[PDB]
Design a protein around this ligand. Sequence first.
Ligand SMILES: CC1=C(/C=C/C(C)=C/C=C/C(C)=C/CO)C(C)(C)CCC1
Length: 134
Amino acid sequence: PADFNGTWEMLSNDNFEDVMKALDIDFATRKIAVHLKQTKVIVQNGDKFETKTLSTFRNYEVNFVIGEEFDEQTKGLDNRTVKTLVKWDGDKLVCVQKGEKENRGWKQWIEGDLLHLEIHCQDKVCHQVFKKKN
Ligand SMILES: CC1=C(/C=C/C(C)=C/C=C/C(C)=C/CO)C(C)(C)CCC1
């Protein structure tokens, strides 16, 4: 079983601008955001997840239990309300965010000491990789 617990520092971030544009985040904001390093802080207790996404610009928090749908407010991103549901795919997390934007969600997994995060909206996909610090 994967263990997502820890602090993970971004190594790479590809096609983030494509996803931000699909979310209608304006160009000025995309330009700021694409150049920032991010940190992911995760506390996992079995199916219970507390996560934080940190940057010098804005921070983002999302907490969930596997299989339990909840209202997510993407404040600081696109600031939309979505119905979010995260489930397992083997050792991987797969999240669907039901709402105004079509085909919105993300997929997260570990290979070794690297955390991978795929973020998708409409036909766009962003791939991020993070290295475990603690
Ligand atoms: C666009 C946007 C940002 C991106 C955050 C992303 C999109 C987080 C994805 C969160 C998920 C998938 C949960 C943890 O895996 C941050 C807040 C850095 C700065 C302001 C603009």
